[PDB]
């Protein structure tokens with residue numbers, strides 16, 4: 025569970041992301057594609073080339089969803105319901121892949137927010153991403 | 166989330182275990198130790214030899230807790246508070262290991278309750294062990 | 307593999323008693339039921355709405371036999387699973403887009419099916435050798451992903 | 453360990469800029485802070501109650517430097533990690549009783565630490581090289597477990 029401090033941490037770090045969320049989302053994707061090539065099996069229909077607009081497009085959608093979960097940090101299960109449904113019923117992404125993206129998102133933020141990416145914040149951001157992942161996977165079976 | 170069908174399936178299956186839960190607990194540990202030897206890192210103080218009273222005794226303990234979980238299938242978080250605590254603050258077993266014991270437990274029930282280990286029952290027990298695992302690792306951080 | 311002559315013999319000997327037809331259909335069917343998300347690759351098979359519909363589906367049972375067959379033949383090249391599954395590894399990546407995690411889910415299901423079937427015979431030491439094989443198989447199959 | 457020549461040059465060029473003393477303390481401290489369960493091995497280190505207490509603990513800093521020290525040497529024998537890490541693998545297993553999952557957690561934390569430090573220089577492709585390396589090392593450290 026996310027503590028008040030966690031919540032503060034996350035709103036703070038994400039706050040700094042501001043307008044770059046879109047780009048950091050795309051970047052987290054590319055990092056993931058490169059480090060964990062098995063994740064690519066879910067995007068057989070995408071152009072995964074560097075600077076792919078599909079990836080740009082998708083990076084933004086992921087970022088918006090994360091931004092929406094931060095805005096509703098006290099009611100995530102409800103804020104993300106629709107997305108929880110899509111993932112469980114249509115996409116059916118194996119659960120292990122959430123951890124991989126989470127990881128690539130943490131690397132991206134670390135690479136962009138040196139001042140804010142403190143140990144305390146790192147811990148908070150990791151618990152947050154784990155919670156988002158949990159919600160998204162909650163209706164799988 | 167355990168459906169009502171699941172709760173039913175679980176209680177029935179566990180119902181058949183009966184006076185053998187202790188032996189099945191001991192057998193699941195033994196299978197865990199041999200198949201996933203990294204799990205042994207948590208029991209340096211035990212004699213992990215076959216038929217060891219330490220293993221037998223521990224097997225009973227685990228079995229009993231499961232019993233108690235099936236019985237309070239509706240209120241696991243509460244029925245296992247103490248156990249959640251112990252694991253989060255004392256034992257500190259890495260979360261990956263829970264999946265390993267869960268698997269050795271299925272294997273054990275399957276080998277012992279053939280008639281009862283139907284595909285639907287298999288699905289329920291799995292979800293159940295998963296929920297138990299989630300409860301036991303919920304206070305980790 | 308990193309199988310002990312004794313481990314090799316245990317595997318080999320139990321397998322001799324296996325009906326691939328039946329074990330293959332049951333392993334794939336259980337997979338689709340326990341881990342419903344694996345059904346994403348088998349929409350063309352039909353109605354997988356229930357355990358019953360999954361377990362009875364002939365398309366499932368037949369794909370299951372094809373899978374265990376290939377598996378069964380891999381047991382004869384236990385010292386080079388990599389080379390035995392190379393073309394199958396490419397296929398899975400490049401044609402089927404199957405996430406290798408699926409190979410591990412099945413492996414574990416397979417082990418539960420064997421225990422189910424053999425009861426007593428499927429002892430801790432025998433399961434241990436099987437766990438090494440399924441892991442070995444999954445790794446070989448995932449080897450050519452890029 | 454499928455390090456292409458270019459993946460290896462990339463690992464090596466970046467590692468040239470690292471202050472192992474410093475990175476070692478940061479990576480270990482951060483592990484104890486993000487995954488507090490890992491604190492189970494260090495109850496003789498004293499106060500690990502808060503982030504500052506962990507990060508600044510002279511004992512954590514000293515142990516980190518040691519760990520990263522052995523890791524750097526590993527980086528000069530990329531060809532033979534298993535050989536390089538053999539006595540250490542035995543020690544972690546037999547004496548310290550450290551679950552190998554701990555080695556993967558630290559690798560990921562380390563990757564985040566490198567990203568933290570190098571910013572834009574830690575490009576997608578450099579991360580991918582380092583991902584293979586941390587995994588190779590965790591695998592080598594777990595090879596003697598039994």
Ligand code: HEM
Nearest residue numbers: 063066067082085086089090107115117121122125156157
């Ligand atoms: C916290 C993690 C995640 C978030 C916030 C997220 C969010 C989203 C969103 C907002 C969409 C677009 C749905 C729409 O069309 O409106 C989407 C689609 C999709 N996601 Fe997830 N997702 C996550 C994890 C994953 C992972 C780990 C994978 C697989 C590696 C994945 C695979 C997909 C796929 C294949 C699509 C469909 C894309 C398309 O065809 O345009 N997702 N996700």
Ligand code: HEM
Nearest residue numbers: 204207208223226227230231256258262263266297298301
């Ligand atoms: C299905 C999930 C599990 C349940 C229900 C469970 C239950 C228990 C119980 C009832 C105890 C004994 C409490 C006491 O001594 O009063 C215990 C202790 C312990 N458990 Fe857990 N356990 C589970 C998973 C695990 C796993 C996966 C591991 C490690 C691989 C583990 C490691 C330990 C250890 C090391 C002890 C203490 C042993 C001793 O010194 O006697 N547990 N657990």
Ligand code: HEM
Nearest residue numbers: 344347348372373374376377394402404408409412443447
């Ligand atoms: C023991 C591991 C496995 C083995 C040995 C294996 C083997 C095979 C073989 C021999 C084929 C035949 C295709 C051909 O030659 O054209 C096949 C096809 C296929 N497999 Fe695998 N498989 C394994 C695991 C899986 C899993 C776990 C899944 C998904 C849950 C999967 C999904 C598929 C699909 C979707 C096809 C396509 C068949 C078609 O053309 O309709 N496989 N596999």
Ligand code: HEM
Nearest residue numbers: 490493494518519520522523540548550554555558589593
């Ligand atoms: C890259 C991975 C690692 C490397 C290269 C490494 C290296 C080392 C070295 C060189 C030593 C001292 C050897 C000796 O005392 O003779 C050591 C000790 C130890 N390591 Fe590891 N280590 C690694 C990861 C870890 C992790 C992730 C943990 C725990 C979460 C850990 C737990 C320990 C412990 C508890 C000791 C004994 C410390 C003492 O009391 O002196 N190690 N390690």
